[PDB]
Design a protein around this ligand. Structure first.
Ligand SMILES: Cc1ncc(COP(=O)(O)O)c(/C=N/[C@@H]2[C@@H](O)[C@@H](OP(=O)(O)OP(=O)(O)OC[C@H]3O[C@@H](n4cc(C)c(=O)[nH]c4=O)C[C@@H]3O)O[C@H](C)[C@H]2O)c1O
Ligand SMILES: Cc1ncc(COP(=O)(O)O)c(/C=N/[C@@H]2[C@@H](O)[C@@H](OP(=O)(O)OP(=O)(O)OC[C@H]3O[C@@H](n4cc(C)c(=O)[nH]c4=O)C[C@@H]3O)O[C@H](C)[C@H]2O)c1O
Lengths: 365, 364
């Protein structure tokens, strides 16, 4: 048996005709930038997240960055982020000049440990970016408290959590503003690079709009040193179709994991756990084990495709050396990075395929 | 009759099906980021600009930014640029933490005045961004001269110049590196936002690449604090289809212009001219007039669409006020920005259309 780590076939096949039609439809329109699908996606997406506004942009990274910027964050400003997130959450910060400051997660959730944040706060602090990793939220209520107390803007980095709920509410409406990636492989993935911001803050929004468009609100006029990071009319169209089935497919994903969660019985592996306040969307299904490479190789030899998120920690990436951190400053993220692994869980996976993985996992050593 | 400033129909009708098969083919392959179209297009394009390497990216603004960033450029740095170019040229400099230094253009060619380049060099100056506006080359020759004189990085901003030639040499093969925009409306447009960078410089090419990819050149490892600016497989395939006839559409464009060139004669309209060393691609066929506005409206009420490239100066833009410039500070530009104006010129315009265009123009 051979099980790819990730496979689009099913959901793609599933809407092929409808996708082909969206495309034929806009191509005929010969309008590819800042138009209709942009508007309706934004409106619908914002609707989906239960917040006033949505501004589409070029990618999830860009989403965050635009938000800090719209917040006017940059040099000699600092921003809290979880030690164990995708480096993309850090660039964003760095991209403004601001300084990302790391906070460890709670190994039980893979998400930033609130109880750990205050201690990171400083005169320079300006914001905290709570990332919803793997598809389940950060403990927003607690995070909230502290942000308030300190008057920090709280930004959700919701790239991996489309359609997730925290205590019954939509990821996207839990902080001051959220950022999303529509990268191909997401729960809601574009057919290319894509991202978007969502906020109830009209001003933040308006600004962010302009910055994504050369810093311009009207023709021939440029009010800021913006850039160019928009979401193509094509991608937005593709998103509109997909958004109708997000909830649908996410429940399937949930069904698979439940199945993983009941089935795996191997002492060396810790399976992932859905936070009590969470409705996990399982962007990824991660397990941890001591001899991860071994497990990984075993699995691969068994036709089972895996990936790690992420074997290498931001503070240990050569791109962040300057900071001068080393093995031991974030042991937790360190540990995780060393034992972590992601198993297949794509929409369309079949029991046979699913049982199969459980079985080889359970038979590991 | 009605004349659209632009109009993609003709071409798109023209390639509609092969486009669609490209789309269909890609979707079926479900591989959407950094794949074989990206790879093929890159190769195809570098070859077309006759350089060694091409690095696909998000848009022409990113492309510039990427070149600079790749060249370490940023803070405490100065980059020279036409005072009359598209703002994007400057935003790029700025995103890097560098400071844009503007140089007037040769009104004859609306392109950066080389004579004028040297007086702006400061010891902070690292590159000059020569822009090939509206479809033709700045005069690169003395510029390299200058650049070399000062150990500067010469960067072409070829976003408006797909396939224009300079003394027969292809745009994008002229300095240390070029930036292209695949904005849909360009001579070679994608079906969304698109950018490409070209160069023969392997180390930069290799750097831009990693940068464009979260500063990564190897899964799981990131060496630079980079960004996310790539060219979608979709967009890439689209272009590959387009690249083929880029050359052919560009010629028709040409006839349109030559046409206008003969036929337009009105004492208050200064028709644009193609430099001697150039193979103009006419991304934009711009004319100047002391009564620019009334002319526009005039042309408009006659159903002729036009645009302005551009009405306001980077330096006169709210965005660059920190710059503390004011009218008069950059006269040559201040001037064009007030008299300039773009008229329809799109693959597929019919004789009559053109005729109706010159006709009214003549009538003013
Ligand atoms: C020197 C220089 N450097 C860097 C850059 C940055 O390149 P970029 O970041 O890739 O945009 C530019 C871009 N430069 C151009 C700039 O010249 C300008 O060109 P423009 O005519 O003003 O823009 P336009 O009004 O959108 O479209 C031209 C016509 O095409 C039609 N159209 C347009 C679209 C998008 C469509 O889907 N369907 C249509 O029918 C309607 C319009 O009348 O504004 C663009 C956004 C920039 O990319 C540049 O010129
Ligand atoms: C918390 C957080 N913040 C910000 C960001 C940044 O948002 P962004 O700028 O939009 O990427 C991320 C990004 N998130 C992800 C990051 O987690 C990681 O995801 P990945 O699973 O490691 O990369 P991948 O190998 O492409 O993942 C998916 C699988 O899907 C298959 N695939 C992929 C593609 C693109 C395809 O076309 N066809 C395929 O079949 C191949 C792989 O097996 O790296 C990505 C490039 C980022 O987009 C994030 O997690």
């Amino acid at each position: 048996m051979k099980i790819s780590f990730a496979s689009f076939k099913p959901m793609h096949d599933e809407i092929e005709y409808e996708i082909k039609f969206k495309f034929e439809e806009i191509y005929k329109r010969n309008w590819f930038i800042l138009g209709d699908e942009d508007k309706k996606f934004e409106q619908e997406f914002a609707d989906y997240c239960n917040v006033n506004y949505c501004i589409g942009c070029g990618n999830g990274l860009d989403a965050l960055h635009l938000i800090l910027k719209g917040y006017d964050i940059g040099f000699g400003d600092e921003v809290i982020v979880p030690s164990n997130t995708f480096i993309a959450t850090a660039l964003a910060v760095s991209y403004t000049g601001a300084k990302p400051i790391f906070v460890e997660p709670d190994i039980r959730t893979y998400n930033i440990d609130p109880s750990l944040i205050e201690s990171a706060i400083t005169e320079k602090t300006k914001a905290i970016i709570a990332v919803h990793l793997y598809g389940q939220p950060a403990d927003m209520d607690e995070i909230k408290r502290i942000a308030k107390k300190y008057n920090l803007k709280l930004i959700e980095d919701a790239a991996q959590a489309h359609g997730s709920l925290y205590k019954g509410m939509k990821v996207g409406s839990l902080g001051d503003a959220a950022g999303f990636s529509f990268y191909p492989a997401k729960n809601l993935g574009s057919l290319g690079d894509g991202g978007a911001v969502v906020t109830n803050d009209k001003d933040l929004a308006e600004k962010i709009k302009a910055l994504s468009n050369y810093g311009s609100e009207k023709k021939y006029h440029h009010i800021y040193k913006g850039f160019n990071s928009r979401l193509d009319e094509l991608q937005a169209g593709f998103l509109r179709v997909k958004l109708k089935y997000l909830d649908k497919w996410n429940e399937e994903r949930r069904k698979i994991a439940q199945k993983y969660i009941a089935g795996i019985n191997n002492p060396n592996v810790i399976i992932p756990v859905e936070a009590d306040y969470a409705k996990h969307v399982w962007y990824t299904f991660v397990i941890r084990s001591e001899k991860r490479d071994e497990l990984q190789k075993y699995l691969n030899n068994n036709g089972i495709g895996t990936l790690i998120h992420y074997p290498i920690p931001i503070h240990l990436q050569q791109a962040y050396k300057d900071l001068g951190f080393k093995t031991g400053n974030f042991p937790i993220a360190e540990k995780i990075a060393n034992e972590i692994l992601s198993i297949p869980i794509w929409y369309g996976m079949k029991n046979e395929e699913i049982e199969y993985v459980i079985d080889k996992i359970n038979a590991w050593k």
